[PDB]
Amino acid sequence: GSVEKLTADAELQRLKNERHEEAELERLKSERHDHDKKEAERKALEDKLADY
Secondary structure (H helix, E strand, O other): OOOOOOOHHHHHHHHHOHHHHHHHHHHHHHOOOOHHHHHHHHHHHHHOOOOO
16 A cells, blocks of 8 residues: 555565566555555565565
C-alpha cells in the first residue's frame, strides 16, 4: 500500500523483489490497506525462507 503507515521497511523489500514489484504494488493499490501487511509476509516466504 502506498500509504506506508509503518510498513516502509516492507515497501523497501517490495522494491527488492523487482522481479515481482509491478504485481504486488498494483494489487495493493486497488486491494485493501490491510492487505499490505499480508503482502509483507507473502514476499517474506517468497523471496526467502521467512522474514521474522
